[PDB]
Design a protein around this ligand. Structure first.
Ligand SMILES: OC[C@H]1O[C@H](O[C@H]2[C@H](O)[C@@H](O)[C@@H](O)O[C@@H]2CO)[C@H](O)[C@@H](O)[C@@H]1O
Lengths: 506, 11, 8
């Protein structure tokens, strides 16, 4: 469970979590409510896996692209900012956090990648990707390199891939078409081919990650990096005099960075929704709160009009907005995680020779379009100990073995029947339930494996089989209290029929 | 359909 | 004879 009377906030370790901690103390000084800020690794993965079972933080911070998928999986409370509060942020930022006409997060700040150049090593930054090899040669002469950035995260390579016609999903008729992916067009191939040729020609190194690229640029070892506003603090700390500028063009085209809106969502499972609204609207999303975060790690172009205007004069923020303007706002649709996973695969493989560009992107094109629907379920048994052992048969317990949907939905929409196979010591051990609740009540003396087979109204949709050890004895101060052994799992429907997609989606 | 690659979680 | 079990 999420502890009440406290706020737990998750934010990525590249963002100003110390400055958020300061807003945290401010909130605690005022309200007596303890705020704890954590930066767990792979939180874009950790939040959905914990929040699935109603655990994790009260507040989750990530780029808005993940939030449609979070809200789709029921992981987010719809936020209730008054009209007055909405006027204080840019309408553009609210759009990034609107899924199915519902606001599902508080926008914080607009992030785009820029080219970051050591002004000493390189007074005049390259206007093109193409001139970079010749620059890395002139610089390899002096024991330097031209360019190092994170090749492990497709976010950083995507601007190049998008430059000559790569796209995620083509927007049309007021929605993104998840069948029309632009990952394996001539544009996308030319961009990823150029990245691969930079590696093959030792202008760059395929294992270069965030830490290596950053550490390299901040020690003055590499003339350029590609990174977002958050990276500026560590460069400020370093001796490096740096410019933030427009990304190089590729084949004469602007590099097109995916534009993220750093967004703050409230956990659906939070007992502290009012406290999270208070903290976000009235402490964080103020000039004082954003300054406290921004001075730790720059946010970019903040959603809050008042503070955006104060910061707008900074040329690093103008370059960010220039790159953003050449880029595309990321969709927030659930399919973005599939797209990102697919392109991470293609870029890493291609970059490390494991695949060619054409294989990698052909694979990524198919993976980015792959519809995966998730039905979270709970299954197991409740078992109530009788007053005393019935001697007739020797049974000690009444038990119910069950499968139910995790979230209160109508499982019968797509489930035709659930079969529970009991031990041979039961007559008609193959018990079938065609209608909810999907459960069998029985009496017995023993624990045995029950096999549970779930059937779908589309019979082509392969049945799911579960294994449950019926439990009667937990063994623990609980006495006549009903013993519980239930488990959360997720049923996964990969590219199901439109019939099945319809019943699977309420 | 299949279950998740990741283990079931005790509630 | 499938495995059934109880503690007594
Ligand atoms: O690399 C794929 C990744 O891209 C974006 O994540 C960014 C994030 O937006 C930035 O705030 C910063 O944290 O860098 C990340 C890249 O390592 C997407 O928002 C994310 O969903 C996606 O997986």
């Amino acid at each position: 469970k999420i502890e009440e009377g406290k706020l737990v906030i998750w934010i990525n370790g590249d963002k100003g979590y110390n400055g958020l901690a300061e807003v945290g103390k401010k909130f605690e000084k005022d309200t007596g409510i303890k705020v704890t800020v954590e930066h767990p690794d792979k939180l874009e993965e950790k939040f959905p896996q914990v929040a699935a079972t109603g655990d994790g933080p009260d507040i989750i911070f990530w780029a808005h692209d993940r939030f449609g998928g979070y809200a789709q999986s029921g992981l987010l409370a719809e936020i209730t900012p008054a009209a007055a509060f909405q006027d204080k942020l840019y309408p553009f930022t609210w759009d990034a956090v609107r899924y199915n006409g519902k606001l599902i997060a508080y926008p914080i700040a607009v992030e785009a990648l820029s080219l970051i150049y050591n002004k000493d090593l390189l007074p005049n930054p390259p206007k093109t990707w193409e001139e970079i090899p010749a620059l890395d040669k002139e610089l390899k002469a002096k024991g330097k390199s031209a360019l190092m950035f994170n090749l492990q995260e497709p976010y950083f390579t995507w601007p190049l891939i998008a430059a000559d016609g790569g796209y995620a999903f083509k927007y049309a008729a007021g929605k993104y078409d998840i069948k029309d992916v632009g990952v394996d067009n001539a544009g996308a191939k030319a961009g990823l081919t150029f990245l691969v040729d930079l590696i093959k020609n030792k202008h760059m190194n395929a294992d270069t990650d965030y830490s290596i690229a950053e550490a390299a640029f901040n020690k003055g070892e590499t003339a350029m990096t590609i990174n977002g506003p958050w990276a500026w603090s560590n460069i400020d700390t370093s001796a490096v005099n740096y410019g933030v500028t427009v990304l190089p063009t590729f084949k004469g085209q602007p590099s097109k960075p995916f534009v993220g809106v750093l967004s703050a969502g409230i956990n659906a499972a939070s007992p502290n929704k009012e406290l999270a609204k208070e903290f976000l609207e009235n402490y964080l999303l103020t000039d004082e709160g954003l300054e406290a975060v921004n001075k730790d790690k720059p946010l970019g172009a903040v959603a809050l009009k008042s503070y955006e205007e104060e910061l707008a004069k900074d040329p690093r923020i103008a370059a960010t907005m220039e790159n953003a303007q050449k880029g595309e706002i990321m969709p927030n649709i659930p399919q973005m995680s599939a797209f990102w996973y697919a392109v991470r695969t293609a870029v890493i493989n291609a970059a490390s020779g494991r695949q060619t560009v054409d294989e990698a992107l052909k694979d990524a094109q198919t993976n980015a379009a792959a519809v995966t629907i998730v039905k979270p379920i709970v299954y197991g048994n409740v078992a109530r100990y009788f007053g005393k052992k019935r001697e007739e048969d020797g049974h000690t317990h009444q038990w119910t073995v069950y499968v139910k949907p995790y979230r209160n939905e109508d499982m019968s929409a797509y489930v035709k029947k659930i079969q529970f196979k009991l031990h041979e010591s039961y007559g008609n051990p193959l018990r079938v339930v065609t209608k909810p609740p999907y459960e069998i009540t029985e009496t017995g003396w023993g624990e045995f494996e029950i096999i549970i087979k779930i059937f779908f109204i589309d019979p082509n949709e392969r049945p799911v089989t579960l294994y449950h050890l019926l439990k009667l004895f937990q063994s623990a101060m609980l006495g006549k209290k009903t013993v519980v052994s239930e488990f959360y799992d997720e049923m996964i429907f990969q590219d199901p029929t439109a019939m099945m997609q319809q019943l699977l989606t309420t | 359909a299949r279950t998740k690659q990741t283990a079931r979680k005790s509630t």
